[PDB]
Amino acid sequence: DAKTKVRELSADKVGGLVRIAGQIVRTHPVHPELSRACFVCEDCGVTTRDVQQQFRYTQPTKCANPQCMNRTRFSLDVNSSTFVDFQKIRIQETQAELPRGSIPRTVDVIVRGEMV
Amino acid sequence: DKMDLKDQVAIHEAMEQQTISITKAGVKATLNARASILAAANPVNGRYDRSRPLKYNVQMSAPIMSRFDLFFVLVDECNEVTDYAIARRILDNHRAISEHTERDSVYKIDDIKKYIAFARCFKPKISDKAAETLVREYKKLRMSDSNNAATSSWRITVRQLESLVRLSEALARLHCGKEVLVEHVEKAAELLNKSIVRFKEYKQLSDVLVLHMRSDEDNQKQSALVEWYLSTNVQKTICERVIHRLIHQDHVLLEVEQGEDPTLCVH
Amino acid sequence: VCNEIKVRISQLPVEEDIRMLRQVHLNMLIRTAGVVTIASGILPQLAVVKYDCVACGYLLGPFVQQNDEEVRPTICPSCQGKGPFELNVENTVYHNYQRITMQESPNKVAAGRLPRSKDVILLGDLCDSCKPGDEIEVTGVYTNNFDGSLNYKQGFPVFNTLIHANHITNKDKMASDQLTDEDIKAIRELSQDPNISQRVFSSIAPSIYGHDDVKRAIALALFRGEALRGDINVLLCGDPGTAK
Amino acid sequence: RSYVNDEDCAAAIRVMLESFVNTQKASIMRMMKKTFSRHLTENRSANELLLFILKQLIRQQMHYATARQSVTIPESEFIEKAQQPFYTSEIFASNNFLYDPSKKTIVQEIF
Ligand SMILES: [Zn+2]
Ligand SMILES: [Zn+2]
Structure with a gap:
């Protein structure tokens, strides 16, 4: 029940649970996205599992074999990795929000999984 | 009517096909545009002129004008009673807004929203008597237009039957009927006539004269033509003046041998 | 004539929309349908590669060309060293x-939506089998691969996706203009009758009433003068x- | 056919004349129909000509009654224009033409 207006999205409110309303302008198509990955060490053939991805594609910082010195030479394994359905959307301010003499603001929205 | 001709051509090309096509840079596609259009315009000379047909009072092209089922024309009536009623309605709007007070409608607008949203799931069929009535009403429309061919403001073609079937189906959906009945066709024809409807002695007498001479071409003087008209003093004088205008202004009738009682033939 | 017989597979039971493919269907076999919009020209691609060793003349390979790689050797075993390499023109193999x-069919799109599209790859004797505008139906494998520029475009580690075609039916192929002996016998039996001219003239467009001048003009124009x-x-x- | 026959020539000539005469103004069209009436008018039947006479008279009566749901015409005019069994035909009845012998009159209903 805690609605907030689009212009009230300050940098204070990063990370909290929020409700908002808007009008949808664009709906981009669907892509698979990498979530947790498995990498094979090219030197020794050991699989390192569950490398959690950030916004960027990342390799492990260290081989899982304790008697191995590799930190660079890795190859991704596809049939062990996990993929996530992804969608990107743009929204606009509804007309009832607008202040005096003002043009509507727009936001980028990220959607995952079954809501695609 | 204030759009650019480029944008009007774009709308007409979309309305013809109910599709939009794209071929630019590195994308080609075709799309669907199943939307009903409602439009408003002002007459060209500022006020509607009843002495001319609809083609001159509106700056649209005839292909664009062919796309509309219904045209409605709205004029200032210059009548005291209607002016009083309009003034009372405006002041009732102001009075209701001034005290935050609703009117007493029969139904809620939300109930009407539910009804209109529910009724569009129906797909009524055409009954036998409805088909017979559609044929009869199309005949009536084309007959009356042919009787007023030189004076009707808008022609009648096959497309009016398509519009009539659409209006009948919409009325059946309004009453939630599973079939089109006779009454839907009848009221659709009445509404279509009321939307459509928009010297004459000279035309009638000259028509009688020209029809007799044209029919006499299936068999093949001015006083003899006048005598046939009279058998078929004010009427005789009017017939002489009509023949005089048909010769000397319209040139419909030609004096084959000239004189005070000339021989006459149709141009 | 040949080296290998391919097996094409048809009438796979489950159909998907282009709009409805998810991460479940990766490396599965699927069937879709749509309209062709763009087609490239036919080009040769590497299939099997062999290399020369500059250091001792030994021929390295064969290496079956993978989908998205520049396959190369690093060591020649016959000299046990990292000799320089050249492409062997005489033993390299290509295919078309x-x-x-392909875009979603406009008939099947719901209210107010935009149709989606996919890229399809044809190899070998599947090439040159359709034109832009054709209604087609495709059966193939749905796969994925990484693209760093696509990652930088979207801002998340997204993956490129494709369909590798295995069978195609073109629904817009016209009928074969070839006649049986039964058809030729029927044509002869029709041509023998004396009323055949009026039969042809009146039987063009039977729903339209009258306008025999237009009907005869169209009938004589469907046949041609001899030049x-x-x-x-x-x-x-x-x-x-x-x-x- | 392997060769052009006299019938093929007659068909081509008839198509050419029929297409040419219709393009002119109405008076020139009347004159040329009169001139080439041998080649143009050969294929019609008496029943089709009687339908033409009847429908032309009904059109003239519709114009006349408009200027002065059904049409009635005296039979004597139809007989005189035919001179210048058809009532039993399918063509006559399917065009809603009817006959009354008690008044000797052609009848039609337009609905
Ligand atoms: Zn290692
Ligand atoms: Zn070597």
Whole structure:
């Protein structure tokens, strides 16, 4: 029940649970996205599992074999990795929000999984 | 009517096909545009002129004008009673807004929203008597237009039957009927006539004269033509003046041998 | 004639929309349908590669060319060293390749939505089998691969996706203009009758009533003069609504 | 056919004349129909000509009654224009033409 207006999205409110309303302008198509990955060490053939991805594609910082010195030479394994359905959307301010003499603001929205 | 001709051509090309096509840079596609259009315009000379047909009072092209089922024309009536009623309605709007007070409608607008949203799931069929009535009403429309061919403001073609079937189906959906009945066709024809409807002695007498001479071409003087008209003093004088205008202004009738009682033939 | 017989597979039971493919269907076999919009030209692509060793003349390979790689050796075993390499013109093998783009059919799109599209890859004797505008139906494997530029575009580690075609039916292929002996016998038996001219003239467009001049003009124009233009050209002008 | 026959020539000539005469103004069209009436008018039947006479008279009566749902015409005019069994035909009845012998009159209903 805690609605907030689009212009009230300050940098204070990063990370909290929020409700908002808007009008949808664009709906981009669907892509698979990498979530947790498995990498094979090219030197020794050991699989390192569950490398959690950030916004960027990342390799492990260290081989899982304790008697191995590799930190660079890795190859991704596809049939062990996990993929996530992804969608990107743009929204606009509804007309009832607008202040005096003002043009509507727009936001980028990220959607995952079954809501695609 | 204030759009650019480029944008009007774009709308007409979309309305013809109910599709939009794209071929630019590195994308080609075709799309669907199943939307009903409602439009408003002002007459060209500022006020509607009843002495001319609809083609001159509106700056649209005839292909664009062919796309509309219904045209409605709205004029200032210059009548005291209607002016009083309009003034009372405006002041009732102001009075209701001034005290935050609703009117007493029969139904809620939300109930009407539910009804209109529910009724569009129906797909009524055409009954036998409805088909017979559609044929009869199309005949009536084309007959009356042919009787007023030189004076009707808008022609009648096959497309009016398509519009009539659409209006009948919409009325059946309004009453939630599973079939089109006779009454839907009848009221659709009445509404279509009321939307459509928009010297004459000279035309009638000259028509009688020209029809007799044209029919006499299936068999093949001015006083003899006048005598046939009279058998078929004010009427005789009017017939002489009509023949005089048909010769000397319209040139419909030609004096084959000239004189005070000339021989006459149709141009 | 040949080296290998391919097996194409048809009438796979489950159909998907382009709009409805998810991460479940990766490396599965699927069937879709749509309209062709863009098609590339036919180009040769590497299939099996061998290399020369500059250091000792030994021939390295064969290496089966993978989908998205520049395959190369690093060590020649016959000299046990990292000798320089050259492409062997005499033993490299190629096959035909084509790429098309397919869009959802406009008939099947719901209210107010935009159709989606996919890229399809054709190899070998599947090439040159369709044109832009064709309604087609594709059966193939749905796969994915990484692209760093696509990652930088979207801002998240997204993956490129494709369909590798295995069977195609073109729904817009016209019928074969070939006649059986039964058809030729029927044509002869029709041509023997004396009323055949009036049969043809009146049987063109039987729903339209009258206008025998237009019917005879169309009938004599469907046949052609012998040729020096041989074609017979016809123009009609008429009021709107007169079924022209 | 392997060769052009006299019938093929007659068909081509008839198509050419029929297409040419219709393109002119109405008076020139009347004159040329009168001139080439041998080649143009050969294929019609008496029943089709009687339908033409009847429908032309009904059109003239519709114009006349408009200027002065059904049409009635005296039979004597139809007989005189035919001179210048058809009532039993399918063509006559399917065009809603009817006959009354008690008044000797052609009848039609337009609905
Ligand atoms: Zn390692
Ligand atoms: Zn070597």
